[PDB]
Amino acid sequence: TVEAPSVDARAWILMDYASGKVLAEGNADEKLDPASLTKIMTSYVVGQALKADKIKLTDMVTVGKDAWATGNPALRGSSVMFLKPGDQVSVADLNKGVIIQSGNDACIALADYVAGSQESFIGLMNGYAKKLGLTNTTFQTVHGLDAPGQFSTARDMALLGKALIHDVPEEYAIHKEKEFTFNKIRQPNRNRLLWSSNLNVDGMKTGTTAGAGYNLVASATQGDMRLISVVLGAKTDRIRFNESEKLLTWGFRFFETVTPIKPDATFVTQRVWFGDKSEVNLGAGEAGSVTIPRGQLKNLKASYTLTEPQLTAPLKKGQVVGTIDFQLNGKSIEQRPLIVMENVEEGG
Numbered sequence: 001t002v003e004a005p006s007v008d009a010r011a012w013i014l015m016d017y018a019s020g021k022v023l024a025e026g027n028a029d030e031k032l033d034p035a036s037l038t039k040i041m042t043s044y045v046v047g048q049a050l051k052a053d054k055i056k057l058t059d060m061v062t063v064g065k066d067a068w069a070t071g072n073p074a075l076r077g078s079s080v081m082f083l084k085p086g087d088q089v090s091v092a093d094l095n096k097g098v099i100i101q102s103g104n105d106a107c108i109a110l111a112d113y114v115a116g117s118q119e120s121f122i123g124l125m126n127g128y129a130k131k132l133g134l135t136n137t138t139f140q141t142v143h144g145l146d147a148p149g150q151f152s153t154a155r156d157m158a159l160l161g162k163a164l165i166h167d168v169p170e171e172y173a174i175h176k177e178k179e180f181t182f183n184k185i186r187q188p189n190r191n192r193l194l195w196s197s198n199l200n201v202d203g204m205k206t207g208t209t210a211g212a213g214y215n216l217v218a219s220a221t222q223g224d225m226r227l228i229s230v231v232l233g234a235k236t237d238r239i240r241f242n243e244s245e246k247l248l249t250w251g252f253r254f255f256e257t258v259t260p261i262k263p264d265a266t267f268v269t270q271r272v273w274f275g276d277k278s279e280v281n282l283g284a285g286e287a288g289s290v291t292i293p294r295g296q297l298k299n300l301k302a303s304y305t306l307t308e309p310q311l312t313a314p315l316k317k318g319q320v321v322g323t324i325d326f327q328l329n330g331k332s333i334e335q336r337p338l339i340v341m342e343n344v345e346e347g348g
């Protein structure tokens with residue numbers, strides 16, 4: 001119980017990447033229009049298309065009139081690559097335009113290429129939003145132009161950040177790039193913390209919300225540890241960055257993340273009744289990391305209970321059959337599902 005810092009913003013969250021532990025939070029479930037932070041999910045979707053080899057970096061995309069000054073009034077004086085209809089631009093360039101420059105026209109040109117239309121692309125964004133448990137998130141645009149019925153929260157942004165990092169790492173990697181050059185002009189990354197001396201920050205996106213102020217979703221690493229911070233509705237650009245750096249620095253200073261039960265590791269083996277095998281391996285799967293105050297590892301204790309007195313087949317990989325309890329000094333700090341690590345079908 002280290003005292004959480006004061007944060008000079010509307011809402012915030014600080015989350016450990018490996019354990020999911022929420023180290024600090026304020027109004028983290030309050031709904032706000034995510035505006036430019038939407039492009040985190042745009043990039044998630046494009047990243048999935050690339051990872052699935054449905055599109056390739058080298059593919060040449062034809063820019064449509066929906067991607068233009070003239071032919072889309074909604075792009076009017078937003079951040080833009082200055083694409084024109086009939087332009088041919090690589091997926092790689094449009095991708096960097098979304099990620100590094102946050103260009104709204106690039107989002108549209110990519111969305112059309114990936115999904116056929118903005119509308120079908122927004123469908124994919126919301127599909128993933130549901131899949132990732134972003135329970136307070138709905139996207140209504142491919143570019144995050146403020147829009148009716150478009151909402152997210154600090155919590156959901158940190159979960160989405162975590163997913164981008166974990167699920168499409170090649171796409172995440174582009175978020176630390178300080179510049180890229182298109183049409184022979186350098187376009188800088190607006191994430192000032194990429195230049196921070198005091199932290200290794202490698203992502204991920206800035207924005208504003210009408211009526212709330214300046215936002216940042218950031219992530220940083222220090223040794224084995226990665227933290228994700230979200231700061232929403234800071235009053236100034238300076239505060240937006242500073243309060244983020246404060247939270248990240250605080251997390252690494254006072255906490256450590258350890259993984260007592262590795263993924264794939266067997267925590268305990270239990271007899272099974274009526275199965276094709278007489279025993280089954282149980283473990284934590286991906287949920288075996290915990291974040292604790294520094295110096296506490298020596299006092300960390302892992303134990304288990306089973307929900308039923310005896311396991312009976314069939315058992316499936318991932319099935320929950322009890323709870324793993326982590327205790328610090330006799331006191332329980334974390335519980336996780338005890339899961340089946342291997343299939344055991346019914347005998348016979």
Ligand SMILES: *C(=O)[C@@H](NC(=O)[C@H](N)c1ccccc1)[C@@H]1N[C@@H](C(=O)O)C(C)(C)S1
Binds near residue numbers: 034078144215
């Ligand atoms: C995303 O949220 C963007 N914000 C806007 O497009 C706003 N409509 C806007 C705010 C202030 C001035 C002009 C437009 C991008 N995020 C901003 C930021 O992080 O400060 C931006 C100005 C770089 S554009």
